[PDB]
Design an enzyme around this catalytic site. Structure first.
Site, mmCIF file in Angstrom:
data_model
loop_
_atom_site.group_PDB
_atom_site.id
_atom_site.type_symbol
_atom_site.label_atom_id
_atom_site.label_comp_id
_atom_site.label_asym_id
_atom_site.label_seq_id
_atom_site.Cartn_x
_atom_site.Cartn_y
_atom_site.Cartn_z
ATOM 1 N N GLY A 132 30.660 15.259 37.489
ATOM 2 C CA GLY A 132 29.058 14.694 36.891
ATOM 3 C C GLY A 132 28.622 13.923 39.130
ATOM 4 O O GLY A 132 29.728 14.741 39.504
ATOM 5 N N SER A 133 27.165 14.062 38.747
ATOM 6 C CA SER A 133 27.072 13.099 40.213
ATOM 7 C C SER A 133 27.869 12.167 40.086
ATOM 8 O O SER A 133 26.979 12.154 41.458
ATOM 9 C CB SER A 133 25.558 13.574 39.437
ATOM 10 O OG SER A 133 24.739 15.164 39.631
ATOM 11 N N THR A 134 27.989 11.904 40.053
ATOM 12 C CA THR A 134 28.938 10.641 40.576
ATOM 13 C C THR A 134 29.181 10.815 41.627
ATOM 14 O O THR A 134 29.035 10.123 42.336
ATOM 15 C CB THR A 134 29.808 10.135 39.048
ATOM 16 O OG1 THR A 134 29.214 9.569 38.221
ATOM 17 C CG2 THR A 134 30.298 8.578 40.264
#
Ligand SMILES: *C(=O)[C@@H](NC(=O)Cc1ccccc1)[C@@H]1N[C@@H](C(=O)O)C(C)(C)S1
Length: 641
Positions: free
Chosen positions: A383-385
């Site tokens: 994900g956006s991590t």
């Protein structure tokens, strides 16, 4: 010479029959029963090997140094060295000898008792005495028990001490309501085919204090494996089960009466935890006098295994998942110590090791959230991590200027018309002049997608290859190495951009994510995680530049502190936090409505004392990892600096 080769063949296939356990085939290669020939008939030899080799669990007879000569027109002698595996370990340097026979055209063996064990003569007996080894313990970083052997309270009833009709049904209902047991299950327990009226039929293991015992109910102390954290660490620790006959056939050095690790660390460290069986294997004469001691050694109890786990961090992390699907990994990123490895939902390992109902086991196996999965070792799209890494790569190769502003209008964007109807999407159109700080605070996919496409695939993979993709972590946990994509090339601008903000074909498990993200707590040095306490810290220098860490970490602080930061709910803690959130969308062609995974990365940017990666799998609406992280963050910040 033409017949000496036939004698060497006979000894070889006789040993092979003993090796494969086919004692009948080995017996049919013997001479007729007579003096100076075979000492027993074929059926008597079959029983001799089956009794003796079966008593010591002899497995894998292999020989060496075979020598076959000739002493008569029909009497060929032989000799060889041999070794074998028994219940008490390996038995080597065995000097076997005998004779053969060359009657008719085939060659047979003049069988003697010295072909079971070398020193045996005539009617000698074999005796085996053994002492079970106590299983070692699994303990946390402070010596708290995670898996130990203790005294348990066993609840059970005797059918004769209940009644004869109305008095029996009243006690069964009184026992069912006093120990939280199904009244229909108590009548199924005393109705099994093994139950006699005067027997003690076990029911459940009561883990608290013994309540008032109705008629027929008794409590009996019994030793057994115990897991203090229960389901809070079931996937990591695992459970032990009763050893079967098939287990012994694979490893004779196991204890027929003992327990064997079936999953988790109990299975991974079974050899170290179970110890070695002690005892003596000896030959006696017909009078019972000890003639020769073949094997003898003392019992060695199992070694204790000390983990980096914090037992209180483990329980706090697991309870914070509220029984929802997910996992949480907590580390001390400067050393790699794994403080917590929680997976949810979970199963009861105490119930698992103390006999579980077939119904209760199927409830675990058919639970759609699948409690048996070790989610901390399961690969996910991060994900956006993952923007932290794409940004760090872009800073190091000079593609991203931290202060350069990109013009991004609206909520959707595509490179050109060749993308069709596909577009990168962001959640807010309120900032049209986006820089790196704004992109990280708001989690702007369009900024990340454009910067990824700007640097290109070659530079992107150059930075990616410096992490741990494809590497097998030195951990006693079964896992597959993380991957960038399915193949060595994206062969797609869309896939390249998707990989930029943590989607695409990326697969990284929570532990590997905690390893890759450790660079932001070590100035671009990757520190491999570590579960065994005494292990040495291993690292990887120059994964990302120290300049990139100094640029990104102050922005990650604003992910928490900025009023519009995606992790702003963590500001209530009042502790120094650097975080990055994420929400991955999963829509395989088997579910109509799409699934969403929530993610959270957080560490202390002042002291680098701790670092956590939490996630929710197939999250419910209005649910996230950030909603649940305050309590674990309070504990880690207080105790790990
Ligand atoms: C990274 O995970 C981003 N997520 C998406 O683009 C997919 C998505 C999923 C649900 C709703 C909207 C968009 C961005 N990061 C997450 C996050 O940090 O939680 C956002 C929801 C802010 S979009």
């Amino acid at each position: 010479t033409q017949a000496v080769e036939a004698g060497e063949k006979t000894v070889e296939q006789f040993v092979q029959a003993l090796n494969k356990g086919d004692y009948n085939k080995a017996a049919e290669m013997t001479s007729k029963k007579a003096a100076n020939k075979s000492a027993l008939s074929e059926k008597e030899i079959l029983d001799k090997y089956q009794n003796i080799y079966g008593a010591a669990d002899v497995k894998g007879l292999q020989i060496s140094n075979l020598k076959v000569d000739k002493k008569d027109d029909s009497t060929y002698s032989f000799s060889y060295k041999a070794k074998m595996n028994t219940s008490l370990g390996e038995l080597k340097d065995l000097s076997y000898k005998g004779t053969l026979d060359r009657n008719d055209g085939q060659t047979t063996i003049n069988w003697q008792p010295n072909l079971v064990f070398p020193e045996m003569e005539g009617n000698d007996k074999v005796s085996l005495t053994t002492q079970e080894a106590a299983r070692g313990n699994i303990i946390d970083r402070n010596g708290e028990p995670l898996a130990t052997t203790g005294k348990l309270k066993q609840l059970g009833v005797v059918p004769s001490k209940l009644g004869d009709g109305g008095e029996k049904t009243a006690n069964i209902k009184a026992i069912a309501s006093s120990f939280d047991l199904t009244e229909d299950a108590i009548n199924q327990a005393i109705s099994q085919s093994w139950v006699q009226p005067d027997y003690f039929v076990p029911l459940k293991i009561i883990d608290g204090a013994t309540p008032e015992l109705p008629a027929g109910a008794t409590i009996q102390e019994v030793d057994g494996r115990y897991y203090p954290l229960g389901e809070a660490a079931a996937q990591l620790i695992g459970y032990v089960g009763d050893i079967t006959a098939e287990d012994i056939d694979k490893n004779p050095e196991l204890s027929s009466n003992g327990k064997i690790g079936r999953s988790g660390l109990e299975m991974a460290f079974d050899k170290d935890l179970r110890g070695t069986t002690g005892g003596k294997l000896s030959i006696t004469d017909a009078d019972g006098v000890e003639k020769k001691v073949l094997i003898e050694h003392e019992v060695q109890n199992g070694k204790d295994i000390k983990l980096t786990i914090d037992a209180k961090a483990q329980k706090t992390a697991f309870d914070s998942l509220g029984g929802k699907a997910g996992s949480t990994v907590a580390t001390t990123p400067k050393t790699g110590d794994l403080l917590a490895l929680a997976s949810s939902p979970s199963y009861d390992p105490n119930k698992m090791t103390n006999g579980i109902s077939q119904e209760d086991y199927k409830a675990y196996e058919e639970n759609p959230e699948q409690p048996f999965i070790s989610r901390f070792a399961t690969g996910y799209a991060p994900g956006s991590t993952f923007k932290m890494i794409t940004a760090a790569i872009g800073l190091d190769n000079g593609t991203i200027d931290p202060n350069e502003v990109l013009t991004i209008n609206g909520l959707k964007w595509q490179k050109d018309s060749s993308w069709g109807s596909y577009q990168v999407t962001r959640v807010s159109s309120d900032v049209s002049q986006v820089d790196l700080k704004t992109a990280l605070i708001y989690s702007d996919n369009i900024y990340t997608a454009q910067e990824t496409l700007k640097m290109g695939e070659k530079k992107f993979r150059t930075g990616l290859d410096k992490f741990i993709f494809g590497e097998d972590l030195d951990l006693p946990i079964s896992m597959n190495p993380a991957q960038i994509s399915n193949e060595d090339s994206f062969n797609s601008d869309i896939l390249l951009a998707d990989t930029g903000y943590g989607q695409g074909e990326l697969l990284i498990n929570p532990i590997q994510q905690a390893a890759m993200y450790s660079v932001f707590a070590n100035n671009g040095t990757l520190v491999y995680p570590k579960l065994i306490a005494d292990k040495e810290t291993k690292d990887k220098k120059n994964v990302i530049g120290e300049t990139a860490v100094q640029t990104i970490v102050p922005d990650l602080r604003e992910v928490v502190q900025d009023v519009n930061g995606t992790a702003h709910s963590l500001s209530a803690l009042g502790i120094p936090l650097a975080a990055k959130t994420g929400t991955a969308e999963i829509k395989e062609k088997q579910d109509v409505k799409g699934k969403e995974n929530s993610f959270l990365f957080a560490f202390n940017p002042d002291n680098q004392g701790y670092m956590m990666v939490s996630m929710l799998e197939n999250k419910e609406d209005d649910d996230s990892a950030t909603k649940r992280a305050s309590e674990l963050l309070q504990y880690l910040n207080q105790n790990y600096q």
